[PDB]
Point group: C5
Chain length 376, copies 5
């Protein structure tokens, strides 16, 4: 994740132009290697045509250069790339939306599961840990960064996501599929036990806990789906052949011919095909957006920070269910205790953002006395 939200807060002079001076997550980082290969091939062909070929061979190469230059437009690269990248970006944001957060669940576990004694602490910690464990099991199944951090269940044990007892239980339950679903069943059974043991006072609170946990389950299932059901390989191959064929053709059709023949469109021989390179930049960068985003759980600069999310979820969830359980700030009358229309102040830097309320678009309509009178 490369965040530049602060740099584009306002539409200032050359707002997006300042972003062209970024390297991490940059288009340069993504397609400099492909561009170097393309440039090498282009100039190898240029030197072959300019030095090796004979007069008749050079004429036959020139005829093919103008034949290829007329079909470079026959390729509908823009359409294919436009639909495919839109599909990849949609899937990318859905995959983010299906990253599980324990915040709703941890608030309900902190509130509903009672007891300041060791048993209450252990019960709350175990429930939240089940939620975190389910999340990490799916994430290590779908995220290469998380897998590299936890290449085995024993690593999850050493890192504190799973106890040795939980590891043994998981081994006992092993089926020939992903076992990421197990902690949800454990959670449901432990919540039932807590309710029967009086730690959850009412079954409506148990229903709320199970609802939040099942929401997390659905998110983890969606992550499994996106990891398993790739964008059809045929659609990916179609877009790839469009881009590569376009630039393979450009490798010949965009050669600078001998100006002597004075072919139409070859009057002046510049050495660098600047607009060909700009088209490469545009089309290959647009494809590289898909190439980076198609699996957003990899290790690209703009891929999701799954490891950070795992660490932050564990810390936050344990703190909320253990230290913050029935641990509230003192409840005292606030600053506006007897102020009917509170008006919090503005700093000198923010005074310009004070606004009158928008009352609705009809507020300033003017009508005559006769217009406003009800009719029988």
């Amino acid at each position: 994740t490369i965040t530049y939200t602060s740099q584009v807060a306002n539409a200032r002079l050359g707002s997006f132009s300042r972003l062209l001076l970024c390297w991490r997550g940059s288009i340069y980082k993504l397609l400099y290697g492909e561009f170097l290969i393309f440039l090498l091939c282009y100039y190898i062909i240029r030197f072959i045509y300019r030095l090796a070929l004979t007069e008749e061979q050079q004429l036959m190469f020139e005829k093919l250069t103008l034949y290829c230059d007329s079909y470079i437009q026959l390729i509908p690269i823009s359409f294919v790339l436009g639909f495919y990248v839109t599909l990849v970006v949609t899937r990318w944001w859905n995959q983010y939306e299906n990253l599980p957060w324990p915040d709703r669940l941890m608030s309900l576990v902190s509130g509903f599961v009672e007891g300041k004694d060791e048993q209450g602490r252990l019960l709350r910690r175990t429930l939240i840990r089940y939620a975190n464990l389910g999340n990490v099991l799916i994430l290590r199944s779908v995220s290469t960064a998380v897998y590299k951090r936890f290449p085995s269940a024993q690593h999850l044990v050493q890192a504190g996501f799973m106890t040795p007892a939980e590891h043994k239980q998981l081994e006992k339950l092993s089926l020939p599929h992903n076992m990421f679903w197990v902690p949800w069943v454990w959670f449901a059974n432990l919540s039932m036990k807590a309710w029967l043991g009086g730690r959850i006072r009412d079954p409506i609170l148990l229903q709320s806990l199970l609802n939040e946990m099942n929401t997390l389950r659905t998110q983890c299932g969606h992550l499994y789906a996106y990891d398993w059901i790739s964008i059809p390989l045929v659609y990916t191959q179609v877009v790839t052949v469009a881009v590569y064929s376009f630039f393979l053709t450009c490798l010949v059709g965009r050669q600078f011919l001998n100006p002597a023949k004075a072919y139409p469109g070859h009057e002046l021989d510049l050495v660098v095909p600047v607009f060909t390179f700009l088209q490469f930049f545009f089309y290959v960068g647009w494809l590289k957006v898909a190439e980076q985003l198609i699996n957003p759980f990899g290790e690209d600069d703009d891929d999701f920070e799954t490891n950070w999310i795992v660490d932050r979820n564990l810390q936050v969830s344990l703190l909320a269910v253990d230290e913050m359980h029935q641990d509230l700030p003192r409840m005292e009358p606030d600053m506006y205790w007897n102020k009917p229309e509170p008006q919090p102040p503005y700093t000198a830097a923010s005074a310009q953002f004070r606004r009158a309320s928008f009352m609705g678009s009809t507020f300033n309509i003017s009508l005559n006395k006769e217009e406003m009178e009800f009719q029988p």
Copy 2:
């Protein structure tokens, strides 16, 4: 936010043409500086070509002017800008949709949390204040206007969003991440305490309160997500290079050459490239839509009024949970108490809007007696 909803209520003669006479939130305000730089560069190049260059240098410049003018169309600016701005507008409206409003929560807190005594008042005020505090913590994390208004937690204390006790508690809980989630945990624990203390009469009402509060939490999480997960920097750089390369090329390809040579398409030498300027207006304004909307929590004219929303939420929520708690208008028989078919009157200005009911599209189908008869 520049509201013009009232001006476009009806499709009147030149409805959208009257909007070209607006300055605030206008396209002129957004790209006058870039346009001035472009115009300066265009005329500097014009004077260089017309005065400095020699006959042969002028001919070589003219050859490049017609070479560049033929590739200005090779750029697929329309496609790149069309997909990117659609993505930015989608994200912009989602970000609005994820601005938290306490209205549902404050109705449930006003109704469910009982007691006209000081303790009931304090409990209701504290719960609603927790909701407002969570909202303001995330908003100051994502909105430059709100941050400038509350550059520190001490400012939140001085403005009445947070008590000194709440500030101390937040400091005690500090982790190396955003603490905007804390007030939700506080809310859940305080609602549990209110239920156990008899201020909430049934656990179904507590479930309702926690559901509304968790909805606000999810909205605040979405705001955090949009602030953190920028549109991929590669996609932004691709669109930026498309626009800038197009107009850099136009800076040469759209020069007015000497009419003497009588080049095709250069017959008449106008001094102002009116259609080039219109293309600049169109493409750069379309890009400036993205530049303004990509971070809708900045300080642009059309950015969201986060400060107003904060103030209005605090005022409304405190009034609803404190002054309006069990404070109802007298319940008396209405104007249509014994009128089976109430028909509220129309003013002379509104009589034209009285309509017969639409009964469905099948209402006027005509069938014969034999057509309408059931068959055995």
Copy 3:
């Protein structure tokens, strides 16, 4: 709202061609004035060129006519108009989807709030009236037709939407923002009072009532949002300049020159630029779709019938909660009381629509005996 659903039920010969003979909500009604101005300007320019200008001035005008005619295509009107109108149509249908209907709420109020005495009647009527009042307050804030019908809160009192007591209470609560939210708080507190007074038998029914009411609140909030957050004025100005610049250019580039010069594409001098007029019809009508739909609560022919919806909601909701409360048709054995497979008859006009059930796409797959046998 111009409904033509019945005319397009079937794909008949020239189904959409018969719709070109409609005036109300027609494209003619929307852009006849603009077209008359355009036609007047076009022929004024034609007469100026044909009569006033000298030979050399006419030649200079002709050179500019063919210069302008070559850039009329440089304008990407189709793209700009295509994205903007799609955004406007999406917002238009969302705004419809957020029009509040009391039907769910009124069924729950009719069922749950008990008592055939005057107090039960008054309680049910007051709750449904709160829902209607919230709806009308937001609608008069966002709809010019509703505002013209209720230009003041006193008009709401005279029309029976609000009692004098409710009006006084609203004045007492006045804040410098829209007060459309107040009736929801009133509803929540009155429902709580009804539950505590035994008129609502269980708190689960109170939860259901509050859920439906909060759904209506969310819809009203969405209406407020769409009224307040206009489509960015920059995007509207961009599309407007695209259309107007295109046709300003056409005003010169589409002039019929003197055939004598025999310019390419000016061989025959027709007096009416039929295809220019068709382009005007197309592009300006496509823009007029946005101009009419951008604020669907105005007074255009195809704008929503907010007044009708208000009247119909009041009538229906009062009837459901008052006259239909525990007022059921006699419950008796039906026509198929002992008929295992009911087959309601068809008329002679409908016999053709009787179909066999679709059993699924796999139903007709044929397999051999050996193919169908399970393997160990």
Copy 4:
């Protein structure tokens, strides 16, 4: 509804080519009449030009044929048709999604409403019948097929959807709007009565019943909305004029001129304008998709089978709430009662579909011993 799902299960050789040999729901059925009119007009113009016109008149007709042929491309038919048909297809699938099914409701009514006696049977049948009656009232309001089957409420009585008592009650309640909402109010009041009479044991079950019923109400409201709020007539007229103007122009611009003059692009005189006819097929068929789908409740081949859905809903719902109420198959130990890893067999035809489980995309990542070691 023309189902071809079975024919396109696999991407076989010429999968979509075999579908060109279908008549029902075919493009031929939809635009053969328009095509015959177009062909007649084209050849009438051909014979007029070839026989009636004089040499000078023929030359003036030829000049107009090449003038019209150059603007046939000026029409942006593809854009207009592409956005409009996408809107129509979106609305078409939403309208399907809002067809009410009693399956959720009938399961809850079968389970929750108790009693094997005549009163329990009558209560369950009456509740499900209310749901079916609401559905049929809206469907006969919006569907021409259903209206033709039930052209009056008396037909609903004769067909068993409504009892004479229900008909009398509906007449007593008559307001000047669609009364499709009434059965929901009846349902809510009858469910309340059943709860108070002990036939529904807990108010949570009553909440579930009312939730499902209100979901059906919302679907029926959406159907009413789509029937009432047509796609703006202006947008429909714009697309219609685009298509018709294009082909009116083609009627002249696509005439085969005399080869003698040897005009560019008229070298060889074929009698049939094959590509003009293919363009007619394409554009008019794309428009006919909208013409058929714009009202999917008509009587086109691909319109929804509303009558079948009505019949199937009545049969299924009555069977589920009456015959299947507490009528369960014997509960006995299953085939895998003591088999920890059940493996249901495969037939010889399905053995090829047995797969190993996908374990996640990270499963095959290989790391060294040192890479896998945790760091302090």
Copy 5:
């Protein structure tokens, strides 16, 4: 399903280029037969023109070759294919999203339905089996792979999805429609019986069970809808005629003529029409994406693995409700029992993914002392 998620984790050099070396689910596999037919026809026409035709016949064929070559662009294949394939891909992902998973339901059944005795085991197994049976009945109705595995209800009995008693009960209930809905009614009635028998302790838990089961019902209904309501056959025929007409025209317009005549664009006679073949690859592969995805439950390589999902659902659901019922790992203090800020370790391979928390986009805004001061 061909998963390549692991290969595209990172945007590496030629990431998508390595995918062109895949056969299963490849574009080659999908359109090699059509391409062979096209190539055969192209070269048959080439040999006919080059050998059979006389001088005048060859000239007439050449005139038609350049006439056809000018209309190959008149076809708007890109637009038609672009909208249709987007619709097919949307439907494809919705169909995946509506594949039922028992995970939520099985967690609730494992937790809520009590008893370690044989009766509790049998009740839990029977409920989960009802859910699985409903899923398999719909899947065998819509999936050719599942139908081939279970070509009769007797096969479902032999495979253990249905008992002989359940089969007899289904036969007794037979109506002339799909009976996939029956197991939901059975589930609701059996859950009611379990609640009345004390196996479900509270009706809120029964409400939760029925909610999850009804969610599965809605998913199965959506699957039935997508199987029944095909994409309109007219839209499919339109796209098919676009592609086939384009390439039929190319069969003549893309012939290599005799270079002797030196026609424009036919200067050099290459034997293989490389760009025609690339266009075939592009357009026909883009169509083959739709052809494979239009019914994603077939037996294509990229079709869903319905059989695997069926097997995995049965195994997982039975294990969760039977072996894991109240079978929890020992609850013991975790690794961070008294560690306020848990920091799970990183491996040497993952150390690079450790990040500082993102605190929000406003975090680094700098303001002066005077700027930060509140104003009165």
